[PDB]
Amino acid sequence: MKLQTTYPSNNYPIYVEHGAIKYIGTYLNQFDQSFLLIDEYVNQYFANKFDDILSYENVHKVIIPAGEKTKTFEQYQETLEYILSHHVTRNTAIIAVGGGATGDFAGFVAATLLRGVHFIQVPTTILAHDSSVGGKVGINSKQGKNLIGAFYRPTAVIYDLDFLKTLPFKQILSGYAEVYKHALLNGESATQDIEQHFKDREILQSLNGMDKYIAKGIETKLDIVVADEKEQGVRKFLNLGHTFGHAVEYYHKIPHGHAVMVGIIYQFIVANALFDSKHDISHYIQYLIQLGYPLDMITDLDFETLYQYMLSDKKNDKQGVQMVLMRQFGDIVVQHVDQLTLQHACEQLKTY
Ligand SMILES: O=C(O)[C@]1(O)C[C@H](CP(=O)(O)O)[C@@H](O)[C@H](O)C1
Numbered sequence: 314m315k316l317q318t319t320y321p322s323n324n325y326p327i328y329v330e331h332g333a334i335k336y337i338g339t340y341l342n343q344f345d346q347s348f349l350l351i352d353e354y355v356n357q358y359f360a361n362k363f364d365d366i367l368s369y370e371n372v373h374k375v376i377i378p379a380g381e382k383t384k385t386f387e388q389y390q391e392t393l394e395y396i397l398s399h400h401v402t403r404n405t406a407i408i409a410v411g412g413g414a415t416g417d418f419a420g421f422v423a424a425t426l427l428r429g430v431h432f433i434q435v436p437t438t439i440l441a442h443d444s445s446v447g448g449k450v451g452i453n454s455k456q457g458k459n460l461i462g463a464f465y466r467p468t469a470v471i472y473d474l475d476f477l478k479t480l481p482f483k484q485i486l487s488g489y490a491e492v493y494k495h496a497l498l499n500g501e502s503a504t505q506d507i508e509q510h511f512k513d514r515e516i517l518q519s520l521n522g523m524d525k526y527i528a529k530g531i532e533t534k535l536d537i538v539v540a541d542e543k544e545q546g547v548r549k550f551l552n553l554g555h556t557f558g559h560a561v562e563y564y565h566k567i568p569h570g571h572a573v574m575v576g577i578i579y580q581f582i583v584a585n586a587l588f589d590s591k592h593d594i595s596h597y598i599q600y601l602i603q604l605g606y607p608l609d610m611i612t613d614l615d616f617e618t619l620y621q622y623m624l625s626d627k628k629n630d631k632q633g634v635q636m637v638l639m640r641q642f643g644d645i646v647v648q649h650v651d652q653l654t655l656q657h658a659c660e661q662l663k664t665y
């Protein structure tokens with residue numbers, strides 16, 4: 314399945330197939346050079362996977378830190394300086410091969426190399442069905458996740474759906490949180506429909522019918538990003554449950570999806586607190602348990618530290634904290650949420 318961003322100028326493809334890993338080479342030699350940034354663990358896993366195209370005269374393998382441990386200022390310099398020492402050109406390409414983390418990083422590298430070079434997204438996780446589309450790249454700060462980065466359109470995205478066969482459950486759950494989020498955004502139908510298909514752990518864990526809920530996720534985003542690339546309003550909707558989520562992920566150091574799920578239920582808690590959309594909290598809470606989500610850190614949360622982090626959030630203004638709330642499937646709204654709600658929603662979410 315091939316897709317394409319419908320922007321005015323410079324648009325990119327997105328190959329979502331079970332052999333998409335082949336679509337790499339139709340580019341490699343049309344670039345003076347190519348630098349393959351690959352996660353340190355992904356590199357072990359798929360040792361020869363990328364020899365068919367790496368044993369070339371242009372391609373060089375660059376091994377960065379595993380996941381979120383690469384998204385730092387320090388690594389940014391090293392990797393860039395290392396790269397440049399190869400007398401590159403403005404027509405070089407950066408091939409990201411790994412999770413969302415190696416993707417954000419390689420992307421921020423590519424986006425700033427000689428003021429911008431070529432970028433090829435090659436996701437290998439479920440969560441990266443999300444992170445590889447939209448052009449958002451970057452690293453982390455001492456203040457929070459993704460606080461330095463940029464909007465840079467990749468030349469093309471290549472999502473080989475065969476990489477899911479090696480994903481551990483902890484990452485299925487993690488990636489599933491984004492597949493589920495796009496669903497919540499797709500309406501009461503798509504939610505209860507995906508909730509109906511992926512009923513419990515064993516279903517998810519098996520991954521049957523996943524190939525479908527991913528393509529549906531990618532599409533759903535491709536729409537919000539083409540329609541509002543610079544997050545000038547609507548794209549703020551992909552941030553569903555990330556306000557609290559990003560705070561739990563950074564401070565509690567738990568997987569992105571896991572935090573997002575917890576960020577989701579908390580968001581409903583607020584949508585009650587304010588609009589009183591009367592959300593079935595007991596429903597969502599349970600559905601997560603079945604799927605197999607941990608929920609052990611729920612008790613170790615801490616409104617105080619999370620709140621201060623929540624002030625770094627990229628959606629706020631001078632007025633204070635800001636969240637993406639759901640009032641009804643098809644009625645998502647963004648707005649201020651003073652410490653009040655955040656004081657009694659982190660405690661009502663503790664009720665569980
Ligand atoms: O607009 C996007 O691409 C996102 O909102 C981007 C966020 C990252 P941000 O909140 O740091 O921009 C990502 O976590 C989410 O899954 C999708």
Ligand SMILES: [Zn+2]
Nearest residue numbers: 491555569573
């Ligand atoms: Zn996310």
